[PDB]
Amino acid sequence: MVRVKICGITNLEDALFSVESGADYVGFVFYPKSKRYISPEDARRISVELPVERVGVFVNEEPEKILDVASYVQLNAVQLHGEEPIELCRKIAERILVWKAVGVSNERDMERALNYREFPILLDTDWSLILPYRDRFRYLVLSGGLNPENVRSAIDVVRPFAVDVSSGVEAFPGKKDHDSIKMFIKNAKGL
């Protein structure tokens, strides 16, 4: 059993379609320098219309901001994507479900990740080296260069709680290819 998260949603059309297609999480990117950036108000319009988990992605943002946005956009989860200190994440977790994203390129990054084992971990990737640690993480989420063609391969090796994607299903930045979302989820969950 594998959940699918569609990140970088900028319009309702895409959001709703992701839901119809079987997506379990939809993610809004609250990072200004991201081509998939979306404002809180714009997101709120979308988020509120969704019956599935809504996730906000933040990169090195201070907690007071994160909480405010979460409250306003009516987010369900928050994905901390920077170098946020453990105490910082716990203060946020006291108010809302948080996933910590950790960059992964080699083995030392995995140990760095274990320091946040208490929170759902989203590995930002080679699946090869995750193996000797796989059974240490609560709810591992896999991300990075995934697409319809390679998901099956990724899943079979790591067998993660959920799979994450963004550009793997785009027509161009910010806009999702409806046919690609269908194919991605289809392959991913094994239909």
Side-chain angles (χ1 to χ4, degrees):
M1 260 301 92
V2 58
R3 273 100 163 161
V4 178
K5 177 178 172 298
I6 300 293
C7 216
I9 288 298
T10 65
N11 57 90
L12 195 68
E13 318 284 86
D14 292 356
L16 292 171
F17 193 78
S18 298
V19 173
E20 305 303 294
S21 298
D24 302 281
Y25 302 94
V26 290
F28 300 118
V29 178
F30 296 119
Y31 180 46
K33 285 180 178 177
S34 177
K35 303 196 199 75
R36 281 130 266 239
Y37 176 76
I38 186 174
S39 71
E41 226 311 304
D42 286 354
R44 193 199 56 82
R45 287 203 194 93
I46 302 178
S47 166
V48 159
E49 219 67 45
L50 307 180
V52 307
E53 282 274 288
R54 311 134 179 182
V55 182
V57 184
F58 296 90
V59 179
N60 287 122
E61 194 58 84
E62 75 154 304
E64 306 292 70
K65 199 43 162 44
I66 293 176
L67 291 186
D68 286 4
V69 174
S71 187
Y72 186 68
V73 178
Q74 275 176 41
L75 290 176
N76 290 320
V78 119
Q79 179 189 319
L80 303 171
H81 222 130
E83 278 55 50
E84 294 94 355
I86 302 82
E87 304 92 357
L88 191 63
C89 298
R90 197 180 288 97
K91 199 179 187 294
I92 296 300
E94 302 167 11
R95 294 288 60 205
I96 186 173
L97 198 222
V98 320
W99 294 2
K100 182 69 178 63
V102 160
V104 176
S105 48
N106 52 241
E107 284 296 84
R108 75 187 303 266
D109 298 309
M110 301 297 316
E111 287 174 26
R112 175 192 160 219
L114 299 164
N115 296 297
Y116 299 89
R117 58 171 296 254
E118 68 196 289
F119 306 108
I121 290 286
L122 183 150
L123 298 183
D124 242 44
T125 313
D126 44 36
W127 329 126
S128 22
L129 53 74
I130 308 176
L131 316 175
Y133 292 94
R134 208 282 152 236
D135 305 285
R136 297 297 294 114
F137 307 114
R138 290 191 147 287
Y139 305 103
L140 151 57
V141 182
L142 190 67
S143 192
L146 294 190
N147 65 41
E149 301 86 66
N150 63 21
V151 251
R152 278 278 61 157
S153 321
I155 298 179
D156 293 317
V157 176
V158 191
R159 318 238 72 128
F161 175 79
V163 96
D164 181 271
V165 74
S166 175
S167 50
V169 300
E170 288 180 331
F172 47 93
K175 190 66 188 66
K176 306 296 182 191
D177 191 75
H178 287 208
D179 204 69
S180 297
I181 298 180
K182 200 184 65 179
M183 287 297 109
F184 184 89
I185 298 163
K186 164 176 160 287
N187 298 8
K189 302 190 181 178
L191 275 52

